[PDB]
């Protein structure tokens, strides 16, 4: 779920408030359209698409589905006890958190005008 995804970001990016990623570019947060503005936005575009795919699984709701994962000693791992829905969503979240940690954060791209800039 989103609480778990937030804790994944706190584990891989402990310099910064998860809220920094909640409204960035065209894809991070609410947005899901237009041309990704940078590398970080591209992480979010892949994450958004990943969730759309997981939604094809019967009864699978990536926003709410609780999966099993661990984050210790610099390592994020989705555990073996996950069903097909949990496993897919966990992996979407894990790959995004890792992506976030490697991409540069441009303060100019936070809270941009989606209606104007994400067509």
């Amino acid at each position: 779920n989103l609480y778990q995804f937030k804790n994944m970001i706190q584990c891989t990016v402990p310099s910064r408030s998860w809220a920094d990623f909640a409204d960035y570019g065209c894809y991070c947060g609410k947005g899901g359209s237009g041309t990704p503005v940078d590398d970080l936005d591209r992480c979010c575009q892949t994450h958004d698409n990943c969730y759309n795919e997981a939604e094809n699984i019967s009864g699978c709701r990536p926003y709410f589905k609780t999966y099993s994962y661990e984050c210790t000693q610099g390592t994020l791992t989705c555990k073996g006890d996950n069903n097909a829905c949990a496993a897919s969503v966990c992996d979407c979240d894990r790959l995004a958190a890792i992506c976030f940690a490697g991409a540069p954060y441009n303060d100019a791209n936070y809270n941009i005008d989606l209606k104007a800039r994400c067509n």
Partner: peptide, 8 residues
């Protein structure tokens, strides 16, 4: 904390 929608 929040219930802001997402961190996509």
């Amino acid at each position: 904390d929040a219930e802001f929608r997402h961190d996509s």
